[model samples]
Target: RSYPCDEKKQNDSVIAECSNRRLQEVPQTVGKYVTELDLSDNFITHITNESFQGLQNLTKINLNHNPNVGLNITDGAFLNLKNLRELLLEDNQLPQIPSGLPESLTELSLIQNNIYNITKEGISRLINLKNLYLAWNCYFNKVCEKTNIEDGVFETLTNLELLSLSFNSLSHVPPKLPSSLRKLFLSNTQIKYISEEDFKGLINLTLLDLSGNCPRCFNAPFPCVPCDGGASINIDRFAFQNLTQLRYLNLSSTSLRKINAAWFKNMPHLKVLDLEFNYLVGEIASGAFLTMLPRLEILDLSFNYIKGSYPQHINISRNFSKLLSLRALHLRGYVFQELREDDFQPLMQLPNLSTINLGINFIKQIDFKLFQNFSNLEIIYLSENRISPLFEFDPHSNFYHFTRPLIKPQCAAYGKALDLSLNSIFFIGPNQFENLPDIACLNLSANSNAQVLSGTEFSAIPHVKYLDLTNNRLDFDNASALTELSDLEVLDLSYNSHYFRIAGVTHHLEFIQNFTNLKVLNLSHNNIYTLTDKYNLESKSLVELVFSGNRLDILWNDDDNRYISIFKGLKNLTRLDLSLNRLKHIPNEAFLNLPASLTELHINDNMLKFFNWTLLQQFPRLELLDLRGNKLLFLTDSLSDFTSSLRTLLLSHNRISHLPSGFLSEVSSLKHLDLSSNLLKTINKSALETKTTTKLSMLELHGNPFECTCDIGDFRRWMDEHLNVKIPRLVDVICASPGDQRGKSIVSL
Candidate 1:
């Protein structure tokens, strides 16, 4: 028997996938040995008992995104496949769960269906079922209909563990859930109350998500609707008392007004508690109510109204000293403006505390002495604050200023990562970063006034490996400031040439050669117009270089021999990005200096009306070439020698209307070709009739004006015969000619 689906062998099982083929029904020709069948994204409307009459060995089936109106399944439709364990039926129109499913089924997904209710008999037979997904059901209207689940419906499924009902309209918890359930997701539901009886027998439950039930609206950047009657979700103090094994609980965006320590009295194993985007205020900011969670390792209380006064001050109560096992604390966007030395005195008792996130707090001052007690601290996030220069001090200053070094000399090394981005820091004083030798990553990006006055600014942090200074006002001429950072591997200096353009300063690229360990460099959007012969980038470890969004119209200098040695020292450069430049055409000599090890080159978003395909000969191992968003109307028929190694070619959004016949045959190794959004009226079948073996697996012909006529029948037939080649967006490859075929897909013709 013949089948249109692709069949493959995995171990001893045969898998068949025929998705998005507009199949009206399951083909009866599939071999009985097929163990997995995927029929998703089709027009299948009915599942008769004989659909898989002989495929008794099938263990998995995917039927998602089928039937626009509704699907009809007869009882015992899947009774023949006793081994079936997994089934996916998402994004379909089904009014109710299918009946007579095999008892061996363990996983079933019915998300985005039209089911409004479920009955016990519908799924009670599947005693082995472990996971069930019913989200987005009854979600057709703004006032969505509630999905009513019968009581004790899932009692027979003794082994069911995971059940997801998010994005549904349920006013309360589904009563009488399986006691074996380990993970339950009810986020974005309309549940407004939680009683002690809601989770009575769920002792083994480990994860519970109730976020977005009663969202908070105060100080919210986006529009939010509070719960009915403008009240928070009422939860009994012992609502989760029986869930002893619960480890993660998410109540974010629930409009919670207070924290009751009794609610967590029974959950000793709880580690992660997320209460972000709530209205917890007043005494809650003191952290007096979190004493019950002694083993909590990660706590997120960000984006809450805990402190409202200007220059908000928080005095964490010593009650938090009880959580000795706590490791990470997140209090971002609390709007706190000051950090007193004693505010976090309680958290110092946590020996495992390693990460603290105080970002987006509007803080104006930082005292190093406050963090001196955290010996295990690894990461500190203070980004998006009001901090300025860290080293400057004044004797008669009104604001607090450090008289000694920011990091004390006798302090033990601790922090490995620091984020001070999006602040007002203008300069780094010499030796300002002394003694904290463990820091490996530092982010100081987006400081509009940042500058390097002297090259000695970073002389102290010699071990720093990753640094980001993007979107700053620093001049590339001061690249000398980073010479001491010989261990730097990745550096981002994009958007830093605003000062160079205003001050009319000349920047040199010679400083890049000093960092022998650098692997990635981003200098895009720096207004660099050219690369002269005087400054050459010499590095053996550099692998990726991004010069995009610059004004580089020419790469070669006035002298021919001098320009060839500019990039001769970069022996291992594998990826180069020169896109978004002002180049109209590339000279043949331009590729002379590019490293031979380059595998990817991006010259997209430029003004190149033509290209020299022979220049690709410089890199025999090149695999990817991106020339999207260019003005090229044509391409060379073939690249004689180096085209065999090219695997991916991106030419989307170009003006090309046709390609030479030899283009496809010459690039025998090409696997992916994107020619979408081009001015092509028709593509002759002869263009793809290559003599050599073709490895083309993906061909994108969408967003083109195809003249659907009798003369193009061969091209249409070729599309049908080559089922191995995937054509993405084939439905959008519409016709532009023959008034009768307008708005019609070429595949339909």
Candidate 2:
């Protein structure tokens, strides 16, 4: 039977979609054979018993975002659909759990509701339920008294596996939860103490999150407060003793002053542990208390109060030999000054360790040999430190020589990434990275004093593919230092040398023609004045180019009228960024030689007053054009000839007061158009009339001074006829003219 909803046939089921139609009642015309129905984003205030009458074959229904206040669902409203398995009612105004849900249901979500309590009889019949989400109940600003869950409320669901009650006002863990659950999330709750009986019977549980319950507030960027009475979360020693199969546990930002070894001795299978943003001190920094979890693989102790004086090495206890399966360790924000070789001597027993992060520390020196023993190491993070040109001692030094026989280093074979950025490194000597030969990624960004003294600094790591020298004080002499890096793929040299105004660095442009395999290059915010024929790039393999925040308005030579393509050899280029360049106009000759393979162009945030629409003929496959934040007063017509593939056009934050007639029909493939924050007063119906088939789906006209006079009646009727097209921020499209409708929404009329 024909219905108001759109119906489609799947492999063996029928689906109906009637969402966002302002529906107040269930559509009675939907066929009984339909298996899925989506009636979300409507204004339905209540659900009667006959809501799904005779739709016995239905298995899924979504009623999300139905924001009517005091929404209600009668008893047995879903009882007729005995086969329903998934039901979503998120972002609703329900006061409590609906009664008489189908017993065959497997998943149900009621997030962002006004439900203040969960009664034992509310969901007792859904024994087959496997996943339940009731987060954000009684949340901030919601008209609710208190959030609560009755004792044994979830005991009837024998098959439940996952449950989330995060962001609620619960003061304690609910009692008698299903033992079959495998995952539980109570993050950002008001629970301050964890008793031994909290998780006493969930032996099959694998993941548990109790973060943000007692968050530490020192230097926190977000609004945070300590636990009640300014005390740390008091967890019973045997709180997690029964979770034998637990694999992941997150207690981050829990204002923990210390950790007890007994808390982990029972969970022998734990793999990942997060205790970041805590007040942990002495014992934890020594790594002696973490030996209980022998199967631990990933550990995070970042942003803790592990302070110490200079030269006071982190004496890892010998007992750490028990963590043989450890792989990643994070120790960021430590206030140490030096790293000694013997400080990490205990980690030699871990054969599977791969990553270690020591960023944001005050370390001044490092012994390169400290990580030489890790055979499978792949990444090393040492950023935001005090390292400098003398970061490491000379490898050829004879001081404190040992009598042991020489052996091959492990990092030389498996090292892949290193981060030395955010430091004071001024010059990189040739022998600085000789110990690691296979490194593929290196970050040297934000080193304010860095200079390309003798480009041979990276000669040791010849296989490196990604290099970042952004926001540095680099003064290039030539490209010879990077000429040998033929395999380099991505390079970022943005924000260097005060917008490239530093004397004797103009030759840096010549470095762009050196790479043979470079694919992506970013030179944005470099304050480049111009690009003449002398600096044409020759990298045939380049794919994306970022030259934004420059001072260029011309790309061709004006003296001889010679059009030398700035992107000469980039045959495979697809994306180009030229935003914030302060360009007044793009000369048509500049596009004569651009690659037709380009699909995306970003030229927003410029001073462009006019653009030649015919210039887009060069990029036949262009898909996105961003001309927002410009000074354009009008658009040229005749764009239909070259914009067949254009899908998105952004003209917001401009001075455009009018659109040409049949503007929507010119770009046949346009799906999203933004005309917000402009000088538009009234849009005539003929301006948007389409002459050909179009994929137009979104039109943004907010922030325009829309005149709500009788002349806009046809435009309002056009909006009503195009129900498939969405106008986001339509509420902000206020009237600007006519005395009675000056501040009213255009849609209200």
TM-score of 1: 0.80
All candidates: CA RMSD (Å): 8.2, 9.2
Candidate 1 local lDDT, residue 525: 90
**lDDT, candidate 1, 1-749, per-residue tens:** 12556577799878887787667888786777788998898889889778888788889999988863377888879877889999988877777888888888999988877777878778878889999888767532444467888888888988999988877788889888889999998877778899999999898899998987887767554445678765777889899989999999988888887777788888889998888887764545555567788889988877774544555575566877787888888777777667877888888888998878887888886764566677778777777888776612121221111134222222213237777789887777663465443567777888775565345777766777788888888855554658878788888889887764553455556677778899988988987654433546777889999989876564443444444455667788999898988878766666667788889989999988988787787778899999999999987876546466799999999999987775655677789989999988887766766677567788888788888898678777777777667776555677988899987778766
Q: Find the candidate with the highest TM-score and give its number.
A: 1
TM-score of 2: 0.74
Give the clashing pairs for model 2. none
Q: What lDDT score goes with residue 304 in model 1?
A: 74
